[PDB]
Amino acid sequence: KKYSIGLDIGTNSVGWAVITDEYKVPSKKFKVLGNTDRHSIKKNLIGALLFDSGETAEATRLKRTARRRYTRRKNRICYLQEIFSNEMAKVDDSFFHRLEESFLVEEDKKHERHPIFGNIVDEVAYHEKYPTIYHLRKKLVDSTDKADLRLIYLALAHMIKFRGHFLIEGDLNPDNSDVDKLFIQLVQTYNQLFEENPINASGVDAKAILSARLSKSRRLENLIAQLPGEKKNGLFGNLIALSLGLTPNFKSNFDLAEDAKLQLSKDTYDDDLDNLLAQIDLFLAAKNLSDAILLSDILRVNTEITKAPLSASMIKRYDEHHQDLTLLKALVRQQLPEKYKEIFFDQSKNGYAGYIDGGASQEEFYKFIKPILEKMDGTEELLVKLNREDLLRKQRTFDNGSIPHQIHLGELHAILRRQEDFYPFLKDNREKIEKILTFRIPYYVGPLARGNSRFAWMTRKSEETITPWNFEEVVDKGASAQSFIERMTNFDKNLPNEKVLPKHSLLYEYFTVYNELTKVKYVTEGMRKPAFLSGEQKKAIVDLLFKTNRKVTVKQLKEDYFKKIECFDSVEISGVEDRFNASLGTYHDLLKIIKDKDFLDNEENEDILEDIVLTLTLFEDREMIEERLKTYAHLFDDKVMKQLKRRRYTGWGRLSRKLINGIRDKQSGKTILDFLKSDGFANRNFMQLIHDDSLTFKEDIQKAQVEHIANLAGSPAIKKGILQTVKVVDELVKVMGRHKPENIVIEMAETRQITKHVAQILDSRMNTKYDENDKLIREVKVITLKSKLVSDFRKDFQFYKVREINNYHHAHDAYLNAVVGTALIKKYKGRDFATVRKVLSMPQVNIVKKTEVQTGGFSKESILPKRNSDKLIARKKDWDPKKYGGFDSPTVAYSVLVVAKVEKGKSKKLKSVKELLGITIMERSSFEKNPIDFLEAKGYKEVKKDLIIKLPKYSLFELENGRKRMLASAGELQKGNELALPSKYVNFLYLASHYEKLKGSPEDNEQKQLFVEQHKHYLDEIIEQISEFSKRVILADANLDKVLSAYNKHRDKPIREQAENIIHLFTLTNLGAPAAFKYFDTTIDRKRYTSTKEVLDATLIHQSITGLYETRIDLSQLG
RNA sequence: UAAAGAUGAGACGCGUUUUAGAGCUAGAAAUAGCAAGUUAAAAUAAGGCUAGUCCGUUAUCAACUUGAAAAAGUGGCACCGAGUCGGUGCUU
DNA sequence: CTAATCGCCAGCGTCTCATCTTTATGCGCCTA
DNA sequence: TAGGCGCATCTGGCGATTAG
């Protein structure tokens, strides 16, 4: 048949050959279908398939989580409104209506332009009293008097929208800033309780607090400098545990059980405090100090006369910026003229022009402003502020990101406690408002769907809508967490219907250690062949050794077993090594927590113990572990539960319950574990037992073992090439008669990657035969091959290639993969070389660009300012493009050809027209079901439905003199022709590019140097070839003469310095989008084909995925 | 073995757009001189219904047939030749 | 006057949690 | 003998411009 096929899968291109008759490229005759009277097309069987790269789901997941966050925030505001409505409907009119209707202009607005009150005098009075919301915040904290419901609503709404980073567990007191002056008190309390009175430096407390804050990695040296005398505990990390937190875990001075390794500020810190206090101070004020340092890091209030230090700090920022601005305004206008307009009265330049109503930022403003005040007198008073980057500060910036929800929590609680006397309506909802602050959906629950979504898994205990106040009542948290863990854990491959066991469970880990110890054998001095341990001595080992010491087999069970066999020592062991692998760590952990070993060794309650390990391996949070352990609280409450809940396990296994102890053999009545315990004189392991001869374990395995195989990870770009290659082979088998190919060769898209499993799909499809001994034979081979062979063959036999000329190189790589792969097989190098030279020279290579309907975002994301243009598209249907707009430049999906009548001019007499029209992504579905209505609504009339042709991206057109174009946009054309550059220029041009690098160490340097020196006329001949090809198919005469002028002048550096730049003229000639390029000093701008009108009267081509079957439509006949 | 990604789940801080923050003085304006600037509301793919505190940017893509559809179909041969596929003979 | 040319512009940084797969090691083994 | 299994160790859009 000589149907040896080949392939070269890639990220953006898949190549293919079809046969290797005489290990040569074949040629074959095909006919076409369509209006053209041609049928004698004799093609090659070589081709390449180019396509866009496959994108990952990371960006899509990011936008999905973003819109989920947005709608949850809107629902939080809606809950806020639901609480406030019953009194705001009586205190105000259309309040939330006018807050929702703030986008619209005064013509579209229905109530009032002013969003807060609805009056102008009250608005300006409110703004002059409070220039910033934080002034109102401080007023509602320190007022001690009743205020307006609208203002307190704005305060709570501000905190609910802008909430906090949610990273600190526990609580922080808002008034814990005077305790920052009690750091000396804390250290002196530690001194008086200690028995050496350690010394300290007074007045350095705040200085050392900011010094250690700046010295994040030099905190050791900072603590050594701040604490004199004894500093071993400070260098160990005790003082950093007091101030910053116990980031390390090393022991400083012990004194609390084994070591002081408890968490500083977390959910487990309170539980770990009981264990530290059991072996018992300084921690009580150390926690307050840890609050104080983080408070003073971000909230700088020197004297505590307020309970709202965030608002106090923002007021200080406002006052500093105002005072220093009115200093600079009076200084610059009196010292430096001719700049005042540029800094103060500009908008489109950096400085204070762009810092307020322009697009400039803080860094650009600082960089602009430094030379301005670097040269005047009375300076450096602001350069010192500039060096600390707190010059002319604004409040709402990036720096207020570390703001704690604990501070907003206690701050809102402070306002509610202050104001609850005056308003009894919202006193009763204080706890649920506080919940609305603190409500988060846990990460193990997921979206609150009903199974229609492909992402949610949560199980509802009760059927009701989910609110923050009924979350624990409606949602069953334990089953939801179990499903969350189980939906992403793999199944066991032997039987895919059951879940696998945890890595550190009793039965599982016991089977691992039993599988090792059954393989552990003993050798005799009499009989040379060692016999397996077996007997009841397998039982005797584990209870006497493994149930007593953690990791008994670390060069230690050896001497322990030698003492056991001290009279049996004529018989010696033949174990794997001195240190074994498995252990009874879970056994000994729960042993050291438990006080009863009888039931544990009784090996009967392992059903209970499996659930015991299951909860600790599955779940994380202490309370939600606790509720599941409450079933055994009838006996495990007092002396177990205090220590067992602190233990947690991490790790999942690969075997399952049903396989390991469910399936037993009827001839013996014993399961696999009992087979390992009492297998007889011959002990078979897991692999030997499951696939043993005359064993019924294989029949039950095959009973349950009998497009979805593509999910093999390896990025979501490679899978596109895999499926395209499968489709290409599937469609090629149809073309080449109906016979099955000889063999398949596939390329790299390490050998352990997705390619090995990708070959198996080709096996499963091609070697499809009867299971009984017909699929046992392999009619066809599928081969994957290492790239070093084809690269060395490339360097050996002079088939070089630069990637910048043409896309024929993809198909030639696929061809060379097939040739060398088949060449290794036929003899178990040849006469091929002249034939392969001929093959790579050939001008007809079936290059197709995969026509694809575009999907993705509708348009650009930036919201542009309003303008009098039709390019802008309304952001929402409610709004208007020219009024607000901002969304322009949409991405089209595909084009269509249409012929119809249309009216134009003042005559209103109708003319006929034939057009190409592009459809956008946003309107595609509207086109599909309403084409006849959609094009008539868009402007045509009396349209003929049967003449409409759909045209995706990269639709191919053919014009006069063999000129082809591809259509990417609606009306922008891309180059469709390829430069069939002969091999004489390529062989020269590679060696010219390699004039000084990799020209051949074994005296191959000199010959290749003189070859390109003596063939320098090839430079001129390539310029003529590019020129002739460009005048015929490219039509780039202006850029061509520009290039010719640059080529003629740049000849003083004529050896290979042309050649690297000559590679850049091929950027003009390649297929696809035109690209700008540089040629020596001159830079050549791209020329863009807008004239889509010429393809209306051209010939349209439809091509198969391999390109061998074509369909041509003559658009002149349709006109 | 640490990194490395690849998947889902829960949260922050900016940015943009429109709107609200009464501009004054002398001049026909031409404009000129002058105060002033730090904040807030709404939206954050149009939208879809199953009306969920859910879904909407990943992956799927030649025409001509029969299928409402999953799909199943669909168009001879060999030598001699190369400028983006031609010549000739067998052949039915 | 309506169609080619030229220059410019494209939404962003941090946290927390889980699973699985890979650069590279064996031990006990097995099927084709 | 290869292949598997269990456990660990940038390129289309758009406004301003020129111009055939």
From Swiss-Prot:
Residues 54-706 are annotated as: Recognition lobe. Keywords: Antiviral defense, DNA-binding, Endonuclease, Exonuclease, Hydrolase, Magnesium, Manganese, Metal-binding, Nuclease, RNA-binding. GO terms for molecular function: 3'-5' exonuclease activity; DNA binding; DNA endonuclease activity; metal ion binding; RNA binding. Changing G885C: Probably inactivates protein. Changing S13A: Decreased DNA cleavage. Changing R76A: Moderately decreased DNA cleavage. Only has nuclease activity when bound to both gRNAs (crRNA plus tracrRNA), which results in conformational changes in the protein and formation of a central channel which binds target DNA. Also requires interaction with PAM to trigger catalytic activity. Nuclease activity is inhibited by EDTA. One of its GO terms (biological process) is maintenance of CRISPR repeat elements. Coexpression of Cas9 with an artificial single guide RNA (sgRNA) which fuses the crRNA with the tracrRNA in human cells has shown it is possible to target and modify DNA sequences of interest. Cas9 plus the 2 sgRNAs have also been expressed individually in human and mouse cells to achieve DNA targeting; cleavage efficiencies of the artificial sgRNA were lower that those for systems with the 2 sgRNAs expressed separately. Microinjection of Cas9-encoding mRNA and a synthetic sgRNA into zebrafish embryos induces targeted mutations. Residues 707-749 are annotated as: RuvC-II. Its cofactor is Mg(2+). It is an enzyme of class 3 (hydrolase). The active site is at D8. The keyword Nuclease applies. Monomer. Binds crRNA and tracrRNA. HAMAP family: Cas9 (MF_01480). This is CRISPR-associated endonuclease Cas9/Csn1. The gene is cas9.
